[PDB]
Write a structure and sequence with these properties.
The structure is a homotetramer of 262-residue chains. Chain A is α/β, with parallel strands linked by helices. Chain A has a single domain (6-255), classed as Rossmann fold (3-Layer(aba) Sandwich). Chain A is 45% helix and 15% strand. In chain A, strands 3-2-1-4-5-6-7 form a seven-stranded parallel β-sheet, sandwiched between helices. In chain A, helix 4 runs parallel beside helix 5 (154-174). The interface between B and D is small, with 8 and 8 residues. The structure holds chloride ion (4 copies) and manganese (II) ion (4 copies). The site of one chloride ion has 4 residues of chain A, from loops. Chains A, B, C, D: One of its GO terms (biological process) is antibiotic biosynthetic process. Chains A, B, C, D: It comes from Pseudomonas aeruginosa (strain ATCC 15692 / DSM 22644 / CIP 104116 / JCM 14847 / LMG 12228 / 1C / PRS 101 / PAO1).
């Protein structure tokens, strides 16, 4: 729809899905802020974005979402620059490959703080902004692991389940403040990580399309292919925008049919 | 989105949510067909639509969705008038107020056949068209009772849960045919049955807006209001279009926060 | 537990899971009634039971659970022979192998009436007895298809999902009557239909145990084997007795780890 | 059943539910170990237990389940004393009263580590024991908040959702080691905490039975009363014992009908 009056903040929004989300936000004419830990990847995205949207209101800034303090400073900077945020998107981050046996206490704590505080901090910092905005909405990006765990990503599965449960609570708590809260459940989505996997394939005669196709078949994905970041982004936009004004405390499945549960 | 090359079919699409959906489809430039039992209401909706959309490719026909033979004939008429269908939407129909103690065998059978065959007939009949079209998608409108039952709608809840489960199965079976299958779960949405409850109110000073707001409060809806047909229609539009190309066998919550489950 | 003061009814309780349940009830000293369509199998089960349990208060009767009138008469016979019922168990029945594309309207209607009325009739008929008894509990045996459908059992899955949903409703409505209502969700359990699949095997050297083990592997059951009737019966016994006095409107998983949902 | 050959360890097992669980374990004739942080409450339980079961094999020991090191030492002590554990139960602990707004980063981290490591440590330490035992089973005590969050216990709800998701993963991972893993979902259960609440009531004319009754009504609990620790304990015993040999990666509802989801 038309988000020319929206101010949308995307935290962790330089990765595949986060980037795609910023692009669609700009397409809709929103003022957009985003932050990332890697200063390099952030500016490499800011560059390409300004190329495509010369007349965009954009504010990019390095930030560690785990550092409450920095998030406070970023949120303040966002307000001064673009005005009170009406939309907040928190990116999923990447999964951690480990069975229970392979996961130390150190890995557990890191994975937990990563998935939880990446949501808790931005939310807490921007909430006083969302509250004063109309059509306010938060979206916490998540994966199907939250409701359908996989054997090689035990810690991540469990953290993501927590965040999923948190989304429901925030939805209920923030309703009186006029803020909707939803998330999405991605399946397997194209990424640099998968491209590095493809690069190290044993079947060299297969191209990216055939390889990912075979991978999706081994992963028993009904749609028979990996998702595209822009497809995740499209569900996020739906949730972030007034298009879903009667939707809060829910999730949208973006896994290509992976969820066995009905 | 750009649905100009789509042919969309809406069964039971003459009332609130049905009509709103047809409108959004026409807005997206889709060719649209719809059917219902009440010819007068159907022709009345058709008229209004042709007013707003002079150059619309539109086909409206009376049809009883429980009658397999009428559904077959309707899908044939759509085919010869607008082309092969690429989008199919099956409306929710209305719920039945009855506890277990109140519901007879015949009421059970009526409710089950209503909810089930309203889906099975149009799907079984349009599938050959959907299967030959690109971006083919089916959306079965359902209610939150399918996963979170209510005491005074026992038969309806159970029936709706069946359909929800059917949606997953259809999604898995039709995926190899290039057809996506999803649904939505409406909460309380403004309807004629609510408008008649309104006209029976004791508090005459309350208007439609004040009344429905008070009802939503007593129903403990976080968003503090009933949904609008167009909000449901937008979620259907999302699921029906290429915007949700990686989403199948899922549902979207349109209940305004009523789902307690996380 | 001590069910010596209980009167338990088991509908469709002449086959594997049914019989095993009746046995466990007799073990707990309960008075027990059971009915089924196959009189020969019923009388055969009755005989064996009276062998093992000389002083048992037992009543077996042929009855078609789809026939409301026969169910009413059976509940009357139980009443006058053993006393008012305090426990009611409704067996799962067998599933139907068919995809959507294979299932006709009539097959749909048959499957829906089978799954639904096998529950509705005994419940509607025994409720007046259950309502007047202490520790009254109803258990509806169901399968994991109710929440996690399978491609070759579409109609059965949808039907079972309906019943699962009905169990929640009945639980809420009967609670003010002092009646608990739960169910179980069986995975693959050893049965006559598996024993006939076994006799059709190509690998003749495999015995029943080796074969079912290989089947469980191919079905990806974590526990690596089919369940046994008695395992299902124990969960039913748990839910049917005072041991689960604070549990109603729920289900117990008896699938050997097949449920992917968390 | 008969657990006279079982060695069962209960961590955090001195509180209401944990204590009740040890008693039933001893009733079944199991050798039992348990640990708690409070040395006082642990010995106050050890005392009463030895009074009731003079011929019991019991080993009680102060331990902080958050301290990996102590848990290692306790597990070792258990083996030397009673032999390899065949059963492991991890108690739920108490919920934390806070909305999202009322929860600091410090409270979040504490609540998370508390709920996660109270499971991760005992499991990791005893797994090499469970693996060598037949009929091995773990039970992680949990609350309905894990799947149905409450507004005044946001952090706890989310942590419990994580643990619930973890139970499913452990179930799958440990299946090849012959170890089942399940949990329970308690509703509101009688406790000292509730007794202190009753003590501070405004309606002094109400006794414990009337007060808890009214509280259950305000909490909309179908069964119209609080649960009893022994009732939670009974579901735990079912899961811990061979009675549930075909059940893994699942949960049993012990909430008196609180779960709205079907
Ligand atoms: Cl992930
Ligand atoms: Cl409805
Ligand atoms: Cl089945
Ligand atoms: Cl809790
Ligand atoms: Mn569910
Ligand atoms: Mn034709
Ligand atoms: Mn669920
Ligand atoms: Mn009588």
């Amino acid at each position: 729809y038309d988000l020319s009056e929206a101010v949308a903040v995307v935290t962790g929004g330089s990765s595949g899905i986060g980037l795609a989300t910023v692009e669609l936000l700009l397409e809709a004419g929103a003022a957009v802020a985003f932050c990332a830990r890697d200063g390099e990847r952030l500016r490499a995205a800011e560059s390409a974005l300004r190329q495509r949207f010369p007349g965009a209101r954009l504010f990019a800034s390095v930030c560690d979402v785990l550092d409450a303090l920095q998030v406070r400073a970023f949120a303040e900077a966002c307000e001064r620059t673009l005005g009170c945020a009406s939309i907040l998107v928190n990116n999923a981050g990447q999964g951690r490959v480990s069975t229970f046996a392979e996961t130390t206490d150190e890995a557990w704590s890191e994975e937990l703080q990563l998935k939880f505080f990446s949501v808790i901090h931005p939310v807490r910092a921007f909430l006083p902004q969302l509250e004063s905005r109309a059509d306010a909405a938060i979206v916490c990006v998540n994966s199907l692991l939250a409701s359908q765990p996989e054997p090689h990503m035990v810690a991540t599965s469990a953290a993501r389940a927590g965040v999923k449960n948190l989304v429901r609570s925030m939805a209920f708590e923030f309703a009186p403040k006029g803020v909707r809260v939803n998330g999405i459940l991605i399946g397997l989505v194209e990424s640099g990580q998968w491209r590095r996997r493809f690069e190290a394939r044993e079947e060299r005669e297969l191209d990216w399309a055939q390889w990912t196709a075979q991978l999706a078949r081994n992963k028993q994905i009904p749609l028979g292919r990996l998702g595209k970041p822009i497809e995740a982004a499209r569900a996020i936009l739906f949730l972030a925008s007034p298009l879903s004004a009667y939707t809060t405390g829910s999730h949208i499945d973006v896994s290509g049919g992976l969820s066995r549960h009905a």
